[PDB]
Amino acid sequence: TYMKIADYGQLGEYTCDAKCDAEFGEPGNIRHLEGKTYDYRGVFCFNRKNLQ
């Protein structure tokens, strides 16, 4: 699994220079998603004399 940082939120606002406080902003998502892995296999035979 791995992280998938979606989109940084909009934090600051350029407010007026009188208020004694900020103003809230939108948050960001991270979306911890996963993914699997496959496998590959097969066989093959032989005689023994017919290979010597």
Binding site: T1, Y2, M3, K4, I5, D7, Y8
Partner: protein, 31 residues
């Protein structure tokens, strides 16, 4: 259950039009 260190984010800035404009630095907030 094998958490990696991969941190694919895939978001862009612009370029910046800041090294073009003339720069001036002030201490007081009224020049």
């Amino acid at each position: 259950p094998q958490v990696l260190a991969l941190e694919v984010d895939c978001n862009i800035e612009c370029a910046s039009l800041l090294d073009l404009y003339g720069q001036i630095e002030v201490s007081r907030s009224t020049f």
